Every structure is written in C-alpha cells, then in structure tokens.
Amino acid sequence: KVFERCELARTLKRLGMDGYRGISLANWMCLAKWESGYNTRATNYNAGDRSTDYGIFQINSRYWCNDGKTPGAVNACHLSCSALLQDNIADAVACAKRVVRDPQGIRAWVAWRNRCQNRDVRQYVQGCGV
C-alpha cells in the first residue's frame, strides 16, 4: 500500500508515534518519505552485506527482523521481515519503536541525517489535522 501523506500522519498518531522517545510526528514522516515514499511494499537488497531493508521504514534484516537469509541476524524485534510488508503498519511501528529505544534513536537511519536532521520538517504534517 502507498499511503497518502495525511493518511499516514493520522495513522502514526493513532499508533502512538507522536513524541515517542522525544521524536515528533514530522520527523517520523520525513523518515518514511525518504526511506520508502510511504510504500509498505518497499524492499532494498544490500549486495555488500547481504541484508535487505523492508517496508515503509526500510528496517534492516541484520539487526531487526528475520528473513532467514541474512548472515549474523539478530532479530531484535522478534519479527519475520514478512510482517513489515503488510498494508497494516502496526508491526512496522512496533519495530520502529524498538529501533529508537537504542541510544542512537532515529539517527540509526542514515537517510534521516541526510534529509531531515536540522531541517524544517513541518511541511510533512501541515494540513493533516494532527
């Protein structure tokens, strides 16, 4: 499923992401936008280390979810990576919350540093009623 901007913003709000571990909703929106373009089916194989990024938040198979084919898999979210390709993002959200409970927080995603950090991210939630 490819979410519309405000549809995703309200969905994230309902799932308790606004202010989670100090991260505003606009920051989560900027992350999803640049990671997948709000597409839950997004997958990206990393030929260099044999891992794959899954779903709307592009969560990696080495540390977070298990796909069975990634060397040194940790599966910190205790989730099949398949759960991150659903139209329903409840599982992706639960895992994203796990990711940010580590010291790095949202900095864990390089894309966030490149395109959201220290920038005006208000535009992502404006007009959504959140």
Curated annotation (Swiss-Prot):
A molecular function (GO) term: identical protein binding
SMART domains, per database record: LYZ1 (SM00263)
InterPro entries, alphabetized: Glyco_hydro_22, Glyco_hydro_22_CS, Glyco_hydro_22_lys, Lysozyme-like_dom_sf
Enzymatic reactions: Hydrolysis of (1->4)-beta-linkages between N-acetylmuramic acid and N-acetyl-D-glucosamine residues in a peptidoglycan and between N-acetyl-D-glucosamine residues in chitodextrins
Chief localisation class: secreted
GO CC annotations, alphabetized: azurophil granule lumen; extracellular exosome; extracellular region; extracellular space; specific granule lumen; tertiary granule lumen
CDD domains: LYZ_C
SUPFAM superfamilies: Lysozyme-like
Positions of the C-type lysozyme domain: 1-130
UniProt entry tagged with the keyword NAD: no
Pathology linked to this chain's protein: Amyloidosis, hereditary systemic 5: A form of hereditary systemic amyloidosis, a disorder characterized by amyloid deposition in multiple tissues resulting in a wide clinical spectrum. AMYLD5 primarily affects the viscera, and the predominant clinical features are renal dysfunction of varying severity, and intra-abdominal bleeding. Inheritance is autosomal dominant.
Protein name (Swiss-Prot/TrEMBL): Lysozyme C
Species, as recorded: Homo sapiens
Gene symbol of the encoding locus: LYZ
